[PDB]
Structures are given as C-alpha cells and as structure tokens.
Amino acid sequence: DSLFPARCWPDPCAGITFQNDTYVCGDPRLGPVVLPQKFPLNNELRTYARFGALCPAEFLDKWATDVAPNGTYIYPPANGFALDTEEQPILGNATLPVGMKLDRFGSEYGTFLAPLGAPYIERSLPPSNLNTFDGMYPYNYHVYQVTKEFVVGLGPIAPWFEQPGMGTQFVTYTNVLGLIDDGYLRRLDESEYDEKVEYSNPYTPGPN
Amino acid sequence: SLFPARCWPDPCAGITFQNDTYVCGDPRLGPVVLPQKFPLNNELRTYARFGALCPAEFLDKWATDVAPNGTYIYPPANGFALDTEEQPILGNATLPVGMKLDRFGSEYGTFLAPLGAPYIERSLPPSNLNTFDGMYPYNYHVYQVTKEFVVGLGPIAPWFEQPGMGTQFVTYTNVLGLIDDGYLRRLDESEYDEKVEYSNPYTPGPNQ
Numbered sequence: 001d002s003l004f005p006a007r008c009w010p011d012p013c014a015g016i017t018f019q020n021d022t023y024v025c026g027d028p029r030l031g032p033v034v035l036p037q038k039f040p041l042n043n044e045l046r047t048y049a050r051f052g053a054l055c056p057a058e059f060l061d062k063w064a065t066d067v068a069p070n071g072t073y074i075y076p077p078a079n080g081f082a083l084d085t086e087e088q089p090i091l092g093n094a095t096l097p098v099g100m101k102l103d104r105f106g107s108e109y110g111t112f113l114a115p116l117g118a119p120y121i122e123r124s125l126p127p128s129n130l131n132t133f134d135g136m137y138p139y140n141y142h143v144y145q146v147t148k149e150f151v152v153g154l155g156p157i158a159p160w161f162e163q164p165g166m167g168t169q170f171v172t173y174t175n176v177l178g179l180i181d182d183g184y185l186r187r188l189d190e191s192e193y194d195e196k197v198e199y200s201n202p203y204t205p206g207p208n
Numbered sequence: 209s210l211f212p213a214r215c216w217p218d219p220c221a222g223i224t225f226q227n228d229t230y231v232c233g234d235p236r237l238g239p240v241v242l243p244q245k246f247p248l249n250n251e252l253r254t255y256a257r258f259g260a261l262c263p264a265e266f267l268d269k270w271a272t273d274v275a276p277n278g279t280y281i282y283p284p285a286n287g288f289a290l291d292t293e294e295q296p297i298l299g300n301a302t303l304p305v306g307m308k309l310d311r312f313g314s315e316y317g318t319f320l321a322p323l324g325a326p327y328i329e330r331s332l333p334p335s336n337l338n339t340f341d342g343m344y345p346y347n348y349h350v351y352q353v354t355k356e357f358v359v360g361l362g363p364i365a366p367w368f369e370q371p372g373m374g375t376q377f378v379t380y381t382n383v384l385g386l387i388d389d390g391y392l393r394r395l396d397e398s399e400y401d402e403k404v405e406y407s408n409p410y411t412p413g414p415n416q
C-alpha cells in the first residue's frame with residue numbers, strides 16, 4: 001500500500017501543474033500529502049486508495065472538467081443517490097432521532113452527512129474533502145449529535161470518484177451551521193467519540 | 209474488556225452457560241475471541257457488542273427470552289430504514305459486474321453488504337460472528353459480481369443496539385444460487401487485503 005499505484009512511477013505527477021506543497025503533486029484537488037494517524041479517522045481511511053488504480057492526471061481527466069488547474073470536479077446526478085432500475089434516485093424522507101451521531105468531511109455550509117464512522121470510500125467524495133481549512137478541525141472532519149428531531153432525505157450513496165460508495169447519506173434542507181444555530185445538532189469533541197461504546201445505539205427502542 | 213464496566217461484578221448474571229467459546233457461554237452473545245487481522249479487525253473497530261447494556265439486559269431487549277430458548281427478534285420490512293410514512297426505503301437496482309460484496313452468514317441467506325462496511329452499519333446480532341466452518345472464520349464471506357443482476361437496495365435500520373445505516377442488498381435468490389448460476393464468484397483473502405482492492409474501477413466517468 002502506497003500513495004501512488006506502482007505503475008505511475010517514475011513520474012507520478014506528470015501532467016499536473018504544481019501549485020502548493022501541502023497537496024499531492026501540489027494540486028489541492030488531489031488532497032493532502034499527510035493523512036490521519038489516529039482513531040477514528042485512521043479507521044475510516046484504512047481502505048482508501050486515493051486514485052484507485054489510476055494515476056493523478058488520469059484521475060482528474062475522468063472525474064473533473066480539466067486536468068489543468070481550472071478543472072473542477074464533476075458530481076453525480078440526482079444529488080448522488082444510488083439510482084434504481086428506472087434511473088430514479090433511491091431515497092425517502094425520514095426523521096432522525098435524538099441521540100443519533102453523524103459526521104461529515106466538509107464545511108458546515110454543506111447539506112450532506114453520514115452516520116458516524118462510515119468509511120471514506122462509502123461516501124463517494126473526492127480527495128479534496130480531506131483538505132484542512134480550520135486548524136481546530138483537521139481534515140475538515142466534523143462530528144455531530146442530533147439534539148432535536150428533524151426530517152432529511154435518506155438513501156444510499158452512488159459510486160463515484162473511483163470509489164464504491166454505498167454508505168447512507170443524509171441530505172438536509174438546512175445546512176449544518178443553520179441546524180446548529182437552530183438547536184437541531186450539537187458539535188461533539190474528540191472525547192465524545194474516542195471509545196467503542198460511543199459508536200453504539202442507546203436511543204432506538206427494542207421490539208418488546 | 210468484554211463488558212461495560214457497570215456490569216461488574218457478575219456480568220453474566222442471568223445467563224445460562226452452554227459453551228466456553230462464547231461470551232458468558234452463550235452462542236447468542238458471539239465469540240470470546242474477535243478478529244485480529246485486516247480487513248475484519250477494521251470492520252469491528254467501532255463495535256461494542258452490547259452497547260452500554262449487560263448481557264441479560266441485551267437479550268431481554270432484543271430476544272424473546274434471556275433463557276437459552278430465547279431467539280433474536282428482527283426488525284420489520286426486512287430491516288430497511290423506514291420513512292416518515294413508515295414505509296421501507298429501497299429500490300430495485302442492478303449490481304454491476306466488478307462490484308465487491310461481503311456477508312456475515314451462511315450462503316443460504318439473501319442479505320449482502322458492500323465490501324468493508326463496519327459491523328455496526330449492518331445491524332446484526334453478536335451471533336452472526338460465530339464460526340460454523342473453519343474455512344470461513346467468523347462466517348465472513350467476500351464475493352464479486354460476475355454477471356449483473358437486480359437486488360433490493362436500501363439503507364439499514366438501526367437494531368440490536370447499533371446505529372445501522374449501511375446499505376443492504378436483499379437478493380431474490382440465495383447467495384448459493386447466485387454463485388451456481390454465475391452471478392457471483394467467491395474471493396480469496398488475497399483479493400481484499402490491499403487498499404486498491406477496495407476501490408472502484410468499473411463505474412464509468414461522466415460524459416464530457
């Protein structure tokens with residue numbers, strides 16, 4: 001296991017315009033050079049091959065508008081829900097219960113969450129969602145807990161970005177920051193998701 | 209540590225001992241020894257097998273009886289997550305050639321998950337980790353799609369003190385039949401021991 005597939009050597013960054021040392025090949029779209037070393041992030045990225053079996057320029061040519069710096073990632077249709085045999089998205093509106101733990105790689109202006117602990121490859125995100133923008137949130141990784149019930153679009157994640165997808169995504173009608181200000185989510189600190197028991201479910205009632 | 213700290217002393221209170229391979233001697237509570245190597249240990253890293261409950265509390269919540277004759281009670285609608293109208297969220301979907309799937313259970317069943325899904329995303333009871341054939345420790349099987357076929361595809365409801373919210377694939381033929389008819393092949397451990405073997409080379413890029 002390594003950064004680039006062996007095929008990409010001896011010049012794995014050929015075709016890529018360097019911009020800044022922090023990122024693979026200097027391209028922010030390729031994500032950070034250094035990756036998480038601690039639980040749970042290392043657990044969530046343990047199965048993540050950043051480019052699949054592709055090389056950097058091949059990856060951008062497949063998934064973005066241009067290999068050059070002006071290129072932007074192209075996203076799946078239908079908000080990225082897995083499509084059924086009639087090419088309709090699979091989802092339903094569902095109430096998230098108080099106590100449920102969610103997480104997200106990305107800014108709090110987004111509307112896509114996952115269940116706490118979902119592998120990165122289940123989220124069908126590009127490498128740049130691992131870029132750090134706030135030092136207090138390395139890798140742009142945020143964990144939340146539902147404090148008041150609310151309804152989201154809930155459904156399977158389509159494969160994209162050379163990953164299998166098939167986690168569950170929650171698509172909110174208010175962005176994360178707005179949900180926090182309105183009392184629907186609260187932020188969790190590392191000490192609240194560092195133990196196995198903190199990943200279990202005490203809020204769903206049993207059948208008896 | 210097999211049990212929540214609150215369960216000491218006498219964490220097996222109320223449990224009839226049957227066989228020393230299982231927690232409290234009870235096969236419903238799963239095996240004493242959990243996976244030590246990759247990928248299985250990665251899938252169980254966030255797994256607290258009783259949540260915050262003690263063994264008898266767990267069986268009282270999720271089974272018909274704490275006594276040996278009690279059996280686990282399963283969620284309605286095949287365990288698909290329910291929407292605000294109490295209807296299961298799923299659709300018929302075609303699984304593409306190349307997709308990798310896994311399963312804790314015998315090949316006579318019909319429930320698969322995407323390769324690498326955490327155990328807690330599957331909403332399975334502890335007994336699905338019991339070994340029945342030495343060739344398949346923890347009853348863990350990995351498959352790859354060799355001919356496309358349609359399955360019921362949808363999010364997994366929380367159950368058994370876990371959050372669920374993986375994706376499940378409910379087949380119309382049992383796994384054994386899908387293998388015999390050429391839709392699935394069995395994977396050797398050597399075919400899912402590297403990160404790149406979890407990526408997705410089969411889904412095509414967007415048309416540009």
Ligand SMILES: *[C@@H]1O[C@H](CO[C@@H]2O[C@@H](C)[C@@H](O)[C@@H](O)[C@@H]2O)[C@@H](O[C@@H]2O[C@H](CO)[C@@H](O[C@@H]3O[C@H](CO[C@H]4O[C@H](CO)[C@@H](O)[C@H](O)[C@@H]4O)[C@@H](O)[C@H](O[C@H]4O[C@H](CO)[C@@H](O)[C@H](O)[C@@H]4O)[C@@H]3O)[C@H](O)[C@H]2NC(C)=O)[C@H](O)[C@H]1NC(C)=O
Nearest residue numbers: 084085296297298299300301357358359360361379380381
């Ligand atoms: C996913 O696809 C399912 C079908 O998939 C195919 O089949 C499976 C087994 C795989 O092989 C797969 O690969 C295939 O692609 C689909 O299942 C279908 O669902 C429909 C709708 O629910 C079912 O039709 C209903 O059947 C019942 C039973 O019909 C039999 O018995 C009656 C009573 O004796 C006879 O009169 C019939 O002729 C049949 O012999 C009917 O009662 C029912 O009628 C209802 O709807 C009509 C009008 O639509 C009303 O007038 C009635 O009053 C009823 O309200 C439907 O006809 C169909 O049987 C079923 N197929 C199979 C093979 O089971 C499933 O719905 C799909 N799921 C999703 C989420 O899309």
Ligand SMILES: *[C@@H]1O[C@H](CO[C@@H]2O[C@@H](C)[C@@H](O)[C@@H](O)[C@@H]2O)[C@@H](O)[C@H](O)[C@H]1NC(C)=O
Nearest residue numbers: 015016017018065066067068069070071072
């Ligand atoms: C995107 O940019 C392309 C040109 O970029 C070229 O290559 C980079 C690495 C720099 O050397 C730059 O100076 C070069 O001109 C265009 O060919 C392409 O049309 C641009 N995309 C759009 C939509 O205009």
Ligand SMILES: *[C@@H]1O[C@H](CO[C@@H]2O[C@@H](C)[C@@H](O)[C@@H](O)[C@@H]2O)[C@@H](O)[C@H](O)[C@H]1NC(C)=O
Nearest residue numbers: 090091092093094150151152153173174291
């Ligand atoms: C899901 O729900 C949408 C409408 O829900 C209502 O409006 C949104 C903006 C939220 O305020 C929500 O809480 C309200 O109940 C529909 O537009 C959409 O079609 C629904 N989708 C499905 C599959 O039911």
Ligand SMILES: *[C@@H]1O[C@H](CO)[C@@H](O)[C@H](O)[C@H]1NC(C)=O
Nearest residue numbers: 019020021022023028132133
């Ligand atoms: C590249 O961008 C990061 C983002 O903060 C910055 O910390 C770093 O210093 C930049 N590289 C250089 C050489 O300035």
Ligand SMILES: *[C@@H]1O[C@H](CO)[C@@H](O)[C@H](O)[C@H]1NC(C)=O
Nearest residue numbers: 226227228229230338339340
């Ligand atoms: C316990 O279970 C194992 C596995 O099913 C079996 O081989 C063994 O005979 C059982 N009894 C004892 C006493 O180990």
Ligand SMILES: *[C@@H]1O[C@H](CO)[C@@H](O)[C@H](O)[C@H]1NC(C)=O
Nearest residue numbers: 272273274275276277278279
């Ligand atoms: C299980 O065994 C107990 C002990 O006799 C009995 O009371 C109970 O009815 C049996 N069946 C179930 C489903 O609990």
Ligand SMILES: [Ca+2]
Nearest residue numbers: 191192194195
């Ligand atoms: Ca803690």
Ligand SMILES: [Ca+2]
Nearest residue numbers: 398399401402
């Ligand atoms: Ca291998």
